[PDB]
């Protein structure tokens, strides 16, 4: 809600920063196996459970 705690807001800040696609230059590294970010999260699909 609008009225939240600092501890709650600090968790929501981290949840957004982790929710980005894979930067592309990492696909170009030698011996690279990661094709995409497999830990994406949509707000309507899976809840954070905070």
């Amino acid at each position: 809600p609008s009225q939240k705690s600092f501890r709650t807001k600090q968790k929501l800040a981290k949840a957004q920063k982790q929710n980005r696609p894979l930067p592309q230059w990492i696909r170009l590294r030698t011996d690279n196996k990661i094709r995409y970010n497999a830990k994406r999260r949509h707000w309507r699909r899976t809840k954070l459970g905070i």
């Binding site: 501890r7 968790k11 459970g49 905070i50």
Partner: protein, 86 residues
């Protein structure tokens, strides 16, 4: 009306985040963590839950200080500094 109609009244959390283990298992009214037993001095752990020990135990985190005990032991717990070779 115990199915879908009753499932619509779930907006009061029984549990919040625990300060010691950060798991969302701190019971608000009981003021206890159902996971680690906080605020008891001992961690909650049972021999009937062996998989639960796997999830949270030594080596599942950083081991930031125990990492180097073997390295310091192997050198007899030295004191001082290394010398420059002549």
């Amino acid at each position: 009306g115990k199915g879908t109609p009753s499932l619509g009244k779930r907006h009061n959390k029984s549990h919040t985040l625990c300060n010691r283990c950060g798991r969302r298992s701190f019971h608000v009214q009981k003021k206890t963590c159902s996971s680690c037993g906080y605020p008891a001095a001992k961690m909650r752990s049972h021999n009937w839950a062996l998989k639960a020990k796997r999830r949270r135990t030594t080596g599942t985190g950083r081991m930031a200080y125990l990492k180097h005990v073997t390295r310091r032991f192997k050198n007899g717990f030295q004191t001082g500094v290394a010398k420059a070779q002549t």
